[PDB]
mmCIF file of C-alpha atoms (C1' of nucleotides) in Angstrom:
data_model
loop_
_atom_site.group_PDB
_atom_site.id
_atom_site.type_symbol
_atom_site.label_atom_id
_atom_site.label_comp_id
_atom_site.label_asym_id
_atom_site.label_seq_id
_atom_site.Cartn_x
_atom_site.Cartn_y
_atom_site.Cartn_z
ATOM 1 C CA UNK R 1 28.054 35.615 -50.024
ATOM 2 C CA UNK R 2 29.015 33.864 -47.054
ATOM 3 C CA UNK R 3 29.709 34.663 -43.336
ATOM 4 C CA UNK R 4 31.396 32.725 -40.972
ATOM 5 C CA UNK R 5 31.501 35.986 -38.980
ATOM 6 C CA UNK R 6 29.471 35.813 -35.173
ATOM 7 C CA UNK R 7 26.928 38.227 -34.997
ATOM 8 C CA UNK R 8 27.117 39.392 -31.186
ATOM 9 C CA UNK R 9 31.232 39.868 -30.950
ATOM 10 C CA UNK R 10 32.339 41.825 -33.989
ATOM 11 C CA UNK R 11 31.494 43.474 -37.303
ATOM 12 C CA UNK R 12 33.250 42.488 -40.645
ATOM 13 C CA UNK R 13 34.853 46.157 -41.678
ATOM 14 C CA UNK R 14 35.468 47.259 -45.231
ATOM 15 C CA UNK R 15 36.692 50.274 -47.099
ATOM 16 C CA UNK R 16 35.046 52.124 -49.662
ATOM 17 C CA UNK R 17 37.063 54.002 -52.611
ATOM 18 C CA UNK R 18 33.998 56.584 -53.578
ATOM 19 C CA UNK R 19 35.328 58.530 -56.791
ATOM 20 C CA UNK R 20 33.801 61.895 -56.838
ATOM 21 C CA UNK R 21 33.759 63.593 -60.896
ATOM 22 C CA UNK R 22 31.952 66.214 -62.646
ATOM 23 C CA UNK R 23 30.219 63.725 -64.708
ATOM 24 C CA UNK R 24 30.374 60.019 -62.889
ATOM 25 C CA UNK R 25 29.919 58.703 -59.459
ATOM 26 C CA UNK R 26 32.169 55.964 -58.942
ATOM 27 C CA UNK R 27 31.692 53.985 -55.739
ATOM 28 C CA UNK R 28 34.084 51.206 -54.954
ATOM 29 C CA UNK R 29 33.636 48.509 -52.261
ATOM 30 C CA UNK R 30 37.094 46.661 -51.430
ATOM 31 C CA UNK R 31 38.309 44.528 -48.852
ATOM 32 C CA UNK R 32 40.918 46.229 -46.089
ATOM 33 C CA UNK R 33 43.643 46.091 -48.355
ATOM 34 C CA UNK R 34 42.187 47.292 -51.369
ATOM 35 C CA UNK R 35 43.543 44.525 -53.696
ATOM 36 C CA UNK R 36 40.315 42.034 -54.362
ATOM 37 C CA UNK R 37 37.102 44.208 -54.547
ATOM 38 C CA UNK R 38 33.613 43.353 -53.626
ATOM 39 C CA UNK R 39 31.170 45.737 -55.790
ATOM 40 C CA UNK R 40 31.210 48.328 -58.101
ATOM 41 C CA UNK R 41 28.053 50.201 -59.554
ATOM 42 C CA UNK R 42 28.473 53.835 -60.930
ATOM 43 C CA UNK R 43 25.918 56.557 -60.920
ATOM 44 C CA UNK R 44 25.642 56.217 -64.780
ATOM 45 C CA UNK R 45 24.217 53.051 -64.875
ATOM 46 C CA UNK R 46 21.312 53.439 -62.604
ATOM 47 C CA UNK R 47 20.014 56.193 -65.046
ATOM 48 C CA UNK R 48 19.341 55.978 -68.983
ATOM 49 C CA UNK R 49 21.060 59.209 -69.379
ATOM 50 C CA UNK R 50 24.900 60.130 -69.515
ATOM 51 C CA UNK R 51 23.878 63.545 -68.632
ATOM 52 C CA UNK R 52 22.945 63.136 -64.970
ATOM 53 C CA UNK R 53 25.728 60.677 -63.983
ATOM 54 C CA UNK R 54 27.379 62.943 -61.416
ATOM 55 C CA UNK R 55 23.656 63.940 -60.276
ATOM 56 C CA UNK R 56 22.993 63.943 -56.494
ATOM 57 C CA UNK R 57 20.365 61.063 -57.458
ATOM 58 C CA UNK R 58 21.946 59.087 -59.520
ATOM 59 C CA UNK R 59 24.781 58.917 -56.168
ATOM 60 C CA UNK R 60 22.029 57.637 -53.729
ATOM 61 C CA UNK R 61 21.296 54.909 -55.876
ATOM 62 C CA UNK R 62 24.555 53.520 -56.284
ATOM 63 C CA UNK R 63 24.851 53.763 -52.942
ATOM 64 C CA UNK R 64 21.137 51.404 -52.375
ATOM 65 C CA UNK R 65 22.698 49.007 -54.576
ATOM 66 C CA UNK R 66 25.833 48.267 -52.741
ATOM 67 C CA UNK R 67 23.726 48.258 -49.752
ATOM 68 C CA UNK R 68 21.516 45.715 -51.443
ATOM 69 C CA UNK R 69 24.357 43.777 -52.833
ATOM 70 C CA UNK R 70 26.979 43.798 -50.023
ATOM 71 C CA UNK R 71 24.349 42.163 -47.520
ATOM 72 C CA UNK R 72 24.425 39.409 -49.084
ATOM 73 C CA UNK R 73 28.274 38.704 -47.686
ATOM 74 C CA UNK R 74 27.773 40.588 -44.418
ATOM 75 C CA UNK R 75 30.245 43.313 -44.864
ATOM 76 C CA UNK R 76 28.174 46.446 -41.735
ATOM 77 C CA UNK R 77 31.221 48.233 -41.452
ATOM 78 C CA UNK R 78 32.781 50.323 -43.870
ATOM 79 C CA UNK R 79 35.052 52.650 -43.930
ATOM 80 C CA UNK R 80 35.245 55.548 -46.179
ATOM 81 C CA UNK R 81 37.483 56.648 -48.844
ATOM 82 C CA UNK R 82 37.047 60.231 -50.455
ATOM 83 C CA UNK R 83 38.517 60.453 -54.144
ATOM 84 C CA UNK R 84 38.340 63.690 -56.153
ATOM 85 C CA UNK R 85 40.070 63.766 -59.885
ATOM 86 C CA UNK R 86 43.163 65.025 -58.713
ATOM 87 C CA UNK R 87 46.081 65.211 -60.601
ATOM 88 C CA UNK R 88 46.643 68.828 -62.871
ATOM 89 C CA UNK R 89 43.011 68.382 -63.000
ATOM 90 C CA UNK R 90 40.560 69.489 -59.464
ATOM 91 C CA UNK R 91 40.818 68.369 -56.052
ATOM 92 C CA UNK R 92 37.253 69.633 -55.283
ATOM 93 C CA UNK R 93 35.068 66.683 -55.029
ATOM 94 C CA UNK R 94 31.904 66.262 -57.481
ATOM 95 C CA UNK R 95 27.998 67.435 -56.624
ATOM 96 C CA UNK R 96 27.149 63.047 -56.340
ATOM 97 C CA UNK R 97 29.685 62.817 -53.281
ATOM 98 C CA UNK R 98 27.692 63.842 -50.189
ATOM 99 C CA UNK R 99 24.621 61.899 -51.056
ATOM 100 C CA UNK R 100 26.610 58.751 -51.824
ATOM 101 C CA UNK R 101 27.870 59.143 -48.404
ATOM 102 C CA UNK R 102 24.223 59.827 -47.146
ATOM 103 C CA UNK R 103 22.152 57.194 -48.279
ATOM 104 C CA UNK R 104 24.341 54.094 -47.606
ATOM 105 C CA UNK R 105 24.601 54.381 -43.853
ATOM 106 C CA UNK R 106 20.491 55.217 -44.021
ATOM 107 C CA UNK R 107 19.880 51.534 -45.507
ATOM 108 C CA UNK R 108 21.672 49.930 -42.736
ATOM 109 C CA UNK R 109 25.221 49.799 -43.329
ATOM 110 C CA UNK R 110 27.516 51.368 -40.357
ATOM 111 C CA UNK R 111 30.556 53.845 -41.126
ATOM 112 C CA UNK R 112 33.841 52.838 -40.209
ATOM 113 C CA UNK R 113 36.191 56.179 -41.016
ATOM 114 C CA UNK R 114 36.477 58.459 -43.558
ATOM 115 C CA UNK R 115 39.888 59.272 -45.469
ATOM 116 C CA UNK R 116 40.897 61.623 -48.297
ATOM 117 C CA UNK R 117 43.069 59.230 -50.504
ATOM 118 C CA UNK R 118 42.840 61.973 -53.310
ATOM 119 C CA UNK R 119 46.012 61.876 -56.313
ATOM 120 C CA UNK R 120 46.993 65.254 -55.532
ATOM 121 C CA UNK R 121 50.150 65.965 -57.047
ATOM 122 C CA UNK R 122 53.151 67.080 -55.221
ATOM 123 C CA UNK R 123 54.257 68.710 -58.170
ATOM 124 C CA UNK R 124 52.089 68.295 -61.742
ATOM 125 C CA UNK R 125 52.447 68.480 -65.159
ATOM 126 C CA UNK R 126 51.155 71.140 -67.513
ATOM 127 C CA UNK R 127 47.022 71.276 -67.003
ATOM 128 C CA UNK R 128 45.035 70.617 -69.678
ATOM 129 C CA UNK R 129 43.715 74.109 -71.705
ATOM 130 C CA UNK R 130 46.259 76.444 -73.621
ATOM 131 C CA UNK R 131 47.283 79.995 -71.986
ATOM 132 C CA UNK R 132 43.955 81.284 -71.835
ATOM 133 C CA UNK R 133 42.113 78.187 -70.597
ATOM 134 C CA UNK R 134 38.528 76.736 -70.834
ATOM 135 C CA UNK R 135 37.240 80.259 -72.299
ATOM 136 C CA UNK R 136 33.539 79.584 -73.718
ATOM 137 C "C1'" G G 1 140.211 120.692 -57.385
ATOM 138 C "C1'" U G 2 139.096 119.793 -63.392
ATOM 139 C "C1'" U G 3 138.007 122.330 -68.448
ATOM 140 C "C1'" C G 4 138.060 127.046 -71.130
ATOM 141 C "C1'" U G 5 138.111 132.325 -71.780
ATOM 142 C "C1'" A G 6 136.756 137.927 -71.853
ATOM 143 C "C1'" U G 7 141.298 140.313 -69.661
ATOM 144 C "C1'" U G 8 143.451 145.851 -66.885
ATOM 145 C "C1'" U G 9 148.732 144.330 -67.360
ATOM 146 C "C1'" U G 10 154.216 143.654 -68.001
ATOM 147 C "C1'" G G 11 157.261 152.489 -69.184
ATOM 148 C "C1'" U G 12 156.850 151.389 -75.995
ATOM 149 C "C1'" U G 13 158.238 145.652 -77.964
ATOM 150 C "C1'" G G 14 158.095 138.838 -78.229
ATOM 151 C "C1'" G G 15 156.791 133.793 -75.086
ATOM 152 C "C1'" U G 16 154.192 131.834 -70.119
ATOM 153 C "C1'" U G 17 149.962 131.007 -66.407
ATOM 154 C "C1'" U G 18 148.649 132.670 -62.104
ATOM 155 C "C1'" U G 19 145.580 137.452 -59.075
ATOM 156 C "C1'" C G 20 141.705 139.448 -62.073
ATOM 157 C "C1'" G G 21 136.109 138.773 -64.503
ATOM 158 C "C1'" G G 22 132.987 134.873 -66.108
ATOM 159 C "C1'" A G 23 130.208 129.556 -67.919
ATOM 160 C "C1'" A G 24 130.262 123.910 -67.040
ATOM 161 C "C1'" C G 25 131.953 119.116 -64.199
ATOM 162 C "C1'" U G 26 133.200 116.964 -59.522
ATOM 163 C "C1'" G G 27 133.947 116.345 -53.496
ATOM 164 C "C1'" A G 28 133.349 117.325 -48.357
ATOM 165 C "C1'" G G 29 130.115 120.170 -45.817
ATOM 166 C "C1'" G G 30 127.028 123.943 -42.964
ATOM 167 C "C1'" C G 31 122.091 125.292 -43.084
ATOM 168 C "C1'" C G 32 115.980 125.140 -44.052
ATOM 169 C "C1'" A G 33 110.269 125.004 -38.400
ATOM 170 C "C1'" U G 34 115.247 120.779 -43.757
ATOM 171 C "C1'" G G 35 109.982 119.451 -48.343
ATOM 172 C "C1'" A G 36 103.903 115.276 -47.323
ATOM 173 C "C1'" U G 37 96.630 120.049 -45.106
ATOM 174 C "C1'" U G 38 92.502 116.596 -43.570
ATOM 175 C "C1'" A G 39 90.200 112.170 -45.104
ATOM 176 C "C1'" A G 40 83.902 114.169 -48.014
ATOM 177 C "C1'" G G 41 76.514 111.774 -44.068
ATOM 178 C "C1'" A G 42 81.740 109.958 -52.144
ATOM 179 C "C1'" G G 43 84.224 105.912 -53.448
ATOM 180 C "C1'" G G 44 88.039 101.854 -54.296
ATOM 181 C "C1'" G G 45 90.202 97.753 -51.560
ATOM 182 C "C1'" A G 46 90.874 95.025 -46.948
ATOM 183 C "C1'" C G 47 89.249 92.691 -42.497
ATOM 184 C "C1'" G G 48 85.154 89.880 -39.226
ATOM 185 C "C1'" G G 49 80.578 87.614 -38.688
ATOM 186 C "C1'" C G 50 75.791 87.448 -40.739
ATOM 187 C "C1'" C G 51 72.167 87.374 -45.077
ATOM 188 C "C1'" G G 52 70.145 85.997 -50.123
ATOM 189 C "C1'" G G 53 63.442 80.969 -54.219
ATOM 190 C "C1'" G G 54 71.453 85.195 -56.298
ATOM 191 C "C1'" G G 55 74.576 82.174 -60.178
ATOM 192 C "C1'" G G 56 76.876 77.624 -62.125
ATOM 193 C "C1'" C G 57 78.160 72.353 -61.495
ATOM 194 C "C1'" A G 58 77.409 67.550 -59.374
ATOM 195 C "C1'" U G 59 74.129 64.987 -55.933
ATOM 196 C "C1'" U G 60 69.402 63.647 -53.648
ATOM 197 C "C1'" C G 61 63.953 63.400 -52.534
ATOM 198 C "C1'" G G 62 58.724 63.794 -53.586
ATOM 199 C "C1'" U G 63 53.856 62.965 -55.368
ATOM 200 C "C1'" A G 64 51.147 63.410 -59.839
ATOM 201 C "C1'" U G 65 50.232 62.190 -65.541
ATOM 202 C "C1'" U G 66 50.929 58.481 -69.268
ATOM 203 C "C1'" G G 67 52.097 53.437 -70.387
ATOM 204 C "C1'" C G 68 53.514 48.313 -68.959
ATOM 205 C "C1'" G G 69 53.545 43.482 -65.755
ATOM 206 C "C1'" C G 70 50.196 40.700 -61.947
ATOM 207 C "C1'" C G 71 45.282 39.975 -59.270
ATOM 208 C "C1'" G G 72 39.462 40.819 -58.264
ATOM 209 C "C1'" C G 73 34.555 42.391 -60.150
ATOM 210 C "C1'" U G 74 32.188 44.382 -64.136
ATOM 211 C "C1'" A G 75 28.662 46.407 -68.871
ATOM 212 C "C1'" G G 76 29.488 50.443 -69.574
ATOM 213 C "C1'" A G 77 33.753 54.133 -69.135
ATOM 214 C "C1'" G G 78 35.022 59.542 -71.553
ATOM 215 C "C1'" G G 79 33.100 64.270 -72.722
ATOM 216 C "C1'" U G 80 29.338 68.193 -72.669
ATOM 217 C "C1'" G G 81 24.441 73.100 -71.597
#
RNA sequence: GUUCUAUUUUGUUGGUUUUCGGAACUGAGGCCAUGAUUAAGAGGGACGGCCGGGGGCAUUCGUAUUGCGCCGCUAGAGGUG
């Protein structure tokens, strides 16, 4: 919550680990090497209802509260880092990605760069569903 | 040359193996236009390089999933129309 950091000559950067599902919006505010974070606040807990977690607004708010939260310390720059589910599972990232990445810079935060840090398999295991898959 | 024999035969009577006619063995020959059609827009096999997520064995690398050890923050995380 402190800042010994000058003002004029540089900005504190920061990474953010922004976790992109079909049904949560997890963004994650660490420090440049990712071991001691500063913030976490999902999409599902700025809304009374677990069936708009991944919801484009319930991203934008998550995103107001680390802006609210992180200003505090003095953490401007952050950069960005773009996490799908990966795995067996999809690479595509969820509907609450793009507006997480939309409101934060809008509340005053600056935007360091932007990485795809994604577990995508080499080489998976056997996906989830039988030989017919997700039929419904 | 070796083995055997049908024989015409010794003017008619008794011995003998030759020439005589044959069947087989063996030796030196002469001679033959002296004996082999090509290699299938078929193959077999060889040779020489190249080619193959071809096979088997050993070796090596890579995320990811699950779980464990350590650190930081958290009241929600999963899942679904």
């Amino acid at each position: 919550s402190l800042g010994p950091q000058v003002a004029e000559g540089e900005n504190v950067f920061g990474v953010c680990h922004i976790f992109a599902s079909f049904n949560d919006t997890f963004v994650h505010v660490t420090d440049l090497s990712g071991k001691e974070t500063i913030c976490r606040v999902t999409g599902g807990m700025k809304v009374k209802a677990d069936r708009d977690e991944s919801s484009p607004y319930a991203a934008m708010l998550a995103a107001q509260d680390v802006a609210q939260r992180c200003k505090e310390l003095g953490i401007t720059a952050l950069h960005i880092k773009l996490r799908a589910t990966g795995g067996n599972r999809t690479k595509t990232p969820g509907p609450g990605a793009q507006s997480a990445l939309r409101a934060l810079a809008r509340s005053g935060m600056k935007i360091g760069r932007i990485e795809d840090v994604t577990p995508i398999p080499s080489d998976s295991t056997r996906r989830k569903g039988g030989r017919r898959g997700r039929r419904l």
